[PDB]
């Protein structure tokens, strides 16, 4: 079917490269490390989503004047003024930031939050991109053994 659709558009022939994995057994030694657990990986990403949601609701209820990704100044948008928008911002930026979420938001120099938000950001770092990607990597490393 994909080969026939390749005539209607000469790009469905890219879907035929999936046969190097779902077909011949020259890649089973590598792909078995991923497909061995599978359920563990999807439960890990589910737990990651839940932890990010908890961090999101905490930031939504206690951190207002920080999510201010303004461009050129005096253009506030992409804030945390919405639960779904804040959750998407978290799941899309804070996970891939490589340094937690404290490098993507304003400096927490204001009073009454100098310590609370430092704790928040360091806990996000140590729990999301330190011991929750270590789990994903350990699930791949243990399958080889």
């Amino acid at each position: 079917t994909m080969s026939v659709l390749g005539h209607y558009n000469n790009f469905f022939f890219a879907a035929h490269l999936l046969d190097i994995a779902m077909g011949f057994k020259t890649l089973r030694t590598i792909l078995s490390s991923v497909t061995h657990n599978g359920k563990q990986l999807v439960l890990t990403v589910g737990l990651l989503a839940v932890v990010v949601y908890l961090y999101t609701v905490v930031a939504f209820n206690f951190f207002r004047k920080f999510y201010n990704k303004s461009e050129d100044g005096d253009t506030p948008d992409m804030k945390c003024d919405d639960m779904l928008t804040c959750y998407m911002f978290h799941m899309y930026v804070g996970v891939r930031a490589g340094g937690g979420i404290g490098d993507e938001i304003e400096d927490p120099a204001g009073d009454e939050y100098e310590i609370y938000r430092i704790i928040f950001d360091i806990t996000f770092f140590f729990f999301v991109i330190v011991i929750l990607l270590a789990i994903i990597q350990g699930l791949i490393i243990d399958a080889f053994g």
């Binding site: 009073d111 100098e114 310590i115």
Partner: peptide, 20 residues
Amino acid sequence: MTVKDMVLAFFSSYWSVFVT
């Protein structure tokens, strides 16, 4: 104001160990 007072209030409890 709790960024600087926190550590001082935390150390204020160990006076009971310093006295003994």
